[PDB]
Write an enzyme that holds these catalytic residues in place. Structure first.
Site, PDB file in Angstrom:
ATOM      1  N   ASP A 164       6.258   2.255   5.278  1.00 47.60           N
ATOM      2  CA  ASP A 164       6.852   0.910   5.474  1.00 47.60           C
ATOM      3  C   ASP A 164       6.589   0.025   4.282  1.00 47.60           C
ATOM      4  O   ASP A 164       6.855  -1.189   4.348  1.00 47.60           O
ATOM      5  CB  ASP A 164       6.325   0.288   6.761  1.00 47.60           C
ATOM      6  CG  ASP A 164       4.805   0.234   6.874  1.00 47.60           C
ATOM      7  OD1 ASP A 164       4.188   1.318   6.584  1.00 47.60           O
ATOM      8  OD2 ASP A 164       4.181  -0.828   7.236  1.00 47.60           O
TER       9      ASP A 164
ATOM     10  N   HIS B  83       0.843  -1.178   0.000  1.00 47.16           N
ATOM     11  CA  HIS B  83       0.000   0.000   0.000  1.00 47.16           C
ATOM     12  C   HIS B  83       0.879   1.228   0.000  1.00 47.16           C
ATOM     13  O   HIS B  83       2.089   1.087  -0.140  1.00 47.16           O
ATOM     14  CB  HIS B  83      -1.024  -0.019   1.114  1.00 47.16           C
ATOM     15  CG  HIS B  83      -0.468  -0.168   2.492  1.00 47.16           C
ATOM     16  ND1 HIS B  83      -0.197  -1.372   3.080  1.00 47.16           N
ATOM     17  CD2 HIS B  83      -0.321   0.768   3.448  1.00 47.16           C
ATOM     18  CE1 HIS B  83       0.247  -1.185   4.334  1.00 47.16           C
ATOM     19  NE2 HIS B  83       0.215   0.130   4.550  1.00 47.16           N
TER      20      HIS B  83
ATOM     21  N   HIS C  91       3.826  -6.373  10.010  1.00 46.29           N
ATOM     22  CA  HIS C  91       4.691  -6.201  11.176  1.00 46.29           C
ATOM     23  C   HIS C  91       4.612  -7.437  12.071  1.00 46.29           C
ATOM     24  O   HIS C  91       3.561  -7.982  12.261  1.00 46.29           O
ATOM     25  CB  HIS C  91       4.243  -4.952  11.998  1.00 46.29           C
ATOM     26  CG  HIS C  91       4.146  -3.716  11.152  1.00 46.29           C
ATOM     27  ND1 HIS C  91       5.242  -2.959  10.807  1.00 46.29           N
ATOM     28  CD2 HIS C  91       3.084  -3.103  10.573  1.00 46.29           C
ATOM     29  CE1 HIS C  91       4.905  -1.965  10.009  1.00 46.29           C
ATOM     30  NE2 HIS C  91       3.614  -2.022   9.852  1.00 46.29           N
TER      31      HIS C  91
ATOM     32  N   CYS D  38       0.025  -5.389   5.969  1.00 46.66           N
ATOM     33  CA  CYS D  38      -0.517  -4.744   7.120  1.00 46.66           C
ATOM     34  C   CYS D  38      -1.986  -4.901   7.385  1.00 46.66           C
ATOM     35  O   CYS D  38      -2.354  -4.541   8.520  1.00 46.66           O
ATOM     36  CB  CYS D  38      -0.140  -3.252   7.198  1.00 46.66           C
ATOM     37  SG  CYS D  38       1.680  -3.033   6.953  1.00 46.66           S
TER      38      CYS D  38
ATOM     39  N   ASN E 187      -2.818   1.705  13.943  1.00 45.64           N
ATOM     40  CA  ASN E 187      -3.053   2.889  13.135  1.00 45.64           C
ATOM     41  C   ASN E 187      -4.188   2.722  12.152  1.00 45.64           C
ATOM     42  O   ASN E 187      -3.999   2.063  11.132  1.00 45.64           O
ATOM     43  CB  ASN E 187      -1.758   3.054  12.287  1.00 45.64           C
ATOM     44  CG  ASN E 187      -1.863   4.259  11.359  1.00 45.64           C
ATOM     45  OD1 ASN E 187      -2.740   5.107  11.548  1.00 45.64           O
ATOM     46  ND2 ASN E 187      -0.958   4.299  10.400  1.00 45.64           N
TER      47      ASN E 187
ATOM     48  N   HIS F  45      -6.626  -2.281   6.417  1.00 48.18           N
ATOM     49  CA  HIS F  45      -5.764  -1.346   7.156  1.00 48.18           C
ATOM     50  C   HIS F  45      -5.570  -0.054   6.379  1.00 48.18           C
ATOM     51  O   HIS F  45      -5.457   1.063   6.898  1.00 48.18           O
ATOM     52  CB  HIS F  45      -4.390  -2.032   7.369  1.00 48.18           C
ATOM     53  CG  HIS F  45      -3.247  -1.102   7.602  1.00 48.18           C
ATOM     54  ND1 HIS F  45      -2.943  -0.618   8.805  1.00 48.18           N
ATOM     55  CD2 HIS F  45      -2.319  -0.601   6.709  1.00 48.18           C
ATOM     56  CE1 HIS F  45      -1.870   0.207   8.727  1.00 48.18           C
ATOM     57  NE2 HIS F  45      -1.500   0.220   7.477  1.00 48.18           N
TER      58      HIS F  45
ATOM     59  N   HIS G 167       1.911   3.503   2.442  1.00 50.64           N
ATOM     60  CA  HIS G 167       2.568   3.911   3.663  1.00 50.64           C
ATOM     61  C   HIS G 167       4.075   3.744   3.534  1.00 50.64           C
ATOM     62  O   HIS G 167       4.547   3.020   2.660  1.00 50.64           O
ATOM     63  CB  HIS G 167       2.033   3.201   4.896  1.00 50.64           C
ATOM     64  CG  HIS G 167       0.636   3.637   5.301  1.00 50.64           C
ATOM     65  ND1 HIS G 167      -0.199   2.956   6.110  1.00 50.64           N
ATOM     66  CD2 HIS G 167       0.023   4.836   5.079  1.00 50.64           C
ATOM     67  CE1 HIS G 167      -1.320   3.604   6.358  1.00 50.64           C
ATOM     68  NE2 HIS G 167      -1.188   4.788   5.781  1.00 50.64           N
TER      69      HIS G 167
ATOM     70  N   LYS H  74      -2.602  -8.642  11.414  1.00 52.49           N
ATOM     71  CA  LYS H  74      -1.838  -8.391  12.639  1.00 52.49           C
ATOM     72  C   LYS H  74      -1.183  -9.723  13.066  1.00 52.49           C
ATOM     73  O   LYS H  74      -1.768 -10.823  12.823  1.00 52.49           O
ATOM     74  CB  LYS H  74      -2.748  -7.936  13.800  1.00 52.49           C
ATOM     75  CG  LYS H  74      -3.505  -6.638  13.418  1.00 52.49           C
ATOM     76  CD  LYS H  74      -2.484  -5.519  13.247  1.00 52.49           C
ATOM     77  CE  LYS H  74      -3.151  -4.199  12.803  1.00 52.49           C
ATOM     78  NZ  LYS H  74      -2.203  -3.080  12.905  1.00 52.49           N
TER      79      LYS H  74
HETATM   80 NA    NA Z   1       6.582  -3.676   4.729  1.00 49.53          NA
HETATM   81 ZN   LIG Z   2       0.185   0.935   6.522  1.00 50.41          ZN
HETATM   82 ZN   LIG Z   3       2.298  -1.274   8.236  1.00 49.95          ZN
END
Ligand code: NA
Ligand SMILES: [Zn+2]
Ligand SMILES: [Zn+2]
Ligand code: NA
Ligand SMILES: [Zn+2]
Ligand SMILES: [Zn+2]
Lengths: 227, 227
Positions: free
Chosen positions: B83, B79, B203, B161, B173, B142, B81, B164
């Site tokens: 990270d 996506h 993560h 993401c 977030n 997410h 973001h 989880k």
């Molecule tokens: Na990543």
């Molecule tokens: Zn994200």
């Molecule tokens: Zn993430």
């Protein structure tokens, strides 16, 4: 059973026949399980009734493709209620061909719902690459246009909502029913398919031909006491 | 798990797939572990998500060239973001080709971020010299543009993401989340990849399909408790 998702589970009845249960919370009624069938022959599938909406229908069709390796090409609804044609919109765009009681088609047109394209008035055999699905209209019951589908090679009958499951004790929703023709229709259903091994109702667990007598007791006791 | 630097570790999942963990201090969040994957076939490599910045992306690309003896040619972010695409500027000056959901490209242009060149709207199979990397968009979660990457030959799913890990207890977030779609997207992922052996989140530790049911539980409990 095999839980394909949170609201849908599938049970195999025969090598070519599966029955599914789709769950939906409907205001005024609660958590309602709606049943249909999946029939497969030579990589082609027929869906008998759709879940209540396009979303659940799309999830079910994706599973037949990916896990059953068949393509849905044919559809038949039991009658015009949402637990029968709720997802017909999604199948029609996809090019699935639909067959139904001309009475169902006339009701859908009147009400603003998706309309099946092939109609029949008394009976019709639909071929799924040679495997016959025999559709019959034997009179009113739970709905005025309710039909039954007989699978002669498998000895399975999809009775639909005109039949109640063995855990059900009430006549239920009779807002579009023909209560006075119902007992007669069940007697015709009983005389015409005595060899059904499995009889699948519109809601609840499938069973055998006892579901026919069981439903007839419910309808007759109600007719007797409200009369 | 093997550390190739003080802030990057690698785990081999199959003879062709490795997952990395890259640690960065993110102001206001603390020491965050971000995961990605490296897939290798015939001396060519695909990177799924980059570390949070260019310097860690460079360290990782150097390791693939010098220890894996592969050239990184392909990139796919989960996506928009940091990270997922924090090191895309480095990859693009190197000529790496990027493939992403068309929604991620549209968001990158609007948010003044580096922009992937090839977009797809529902699914896309990227061939890494013969080996298929199947990308799918199955709905928001997410992030509204989050995708999943399926590697059919290895039965490994990079969920990103929208999932989880098993030690995580909060929804985290949700500033760019589509909370109402999240539980449904999860059911679709679950229904489509029943053979997944390893499932890797964006993560935390990887595990199996229980990551999907556990994340659906976290999302559903948050919706229920906050209405
Ligand atoms: Na990543
Ligand atoms: Zn994200
Ligand atoms: Zn993430
Ligand atoms: Na039904
Ligand atoms: Zn009905
Ligand atoms: Zn019904």
């Amino acid at each position: 059973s095999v839980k394909i998702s949170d609201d849908i589970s599938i049970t195999q009845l025969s090598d070519k026949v599966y029955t599914y249960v789709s769950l939906a919370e409907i205001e005024g009624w609660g958590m309602v399980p709606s049943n249909g069938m999946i029939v497969i022959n030579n990589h082609q599938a027929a869906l008998l009734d759709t879940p209540i909406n396009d979303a659940q229908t799309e999830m079910l069709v994706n599973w037949v493709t990916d896990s059953l390796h068949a393509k849905v090409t044919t559809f038949i609804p039991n009658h015009w209620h949402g637990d029968c044609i709720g997802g017909l919109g999604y199948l029609q765009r996809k090019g699935v061909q639909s067959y139904a009681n001309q009475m169902t088609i006339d009701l859908a047109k009147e009400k603003g719902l998706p309309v099946p394209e092939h109609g029949f008035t008394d009976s019709l055999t639909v071929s799924l690459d040679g495997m016959p699905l025999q559709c019959y209209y034997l009179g009113g019951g739970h709905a005025t246009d309710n039909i039954v589908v007989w699978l002669p090679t498998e000895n399975i009958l999809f009775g639909g909502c005109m039949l109640k499951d063995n855990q059900t004790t009430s006549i239920g929703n009779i807002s579009d029913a023909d209560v006075t023709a119902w007992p007669k229709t069940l007697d015709k259903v009983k005389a015409k398919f005595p060899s059904a091994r499995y009889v699948v109702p519109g809601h609840g667990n499938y069973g055998g031909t006892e579901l026919i007598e069981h439903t007839k007791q419910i309808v007759n006791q109600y007719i007797e006491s409200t009369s």
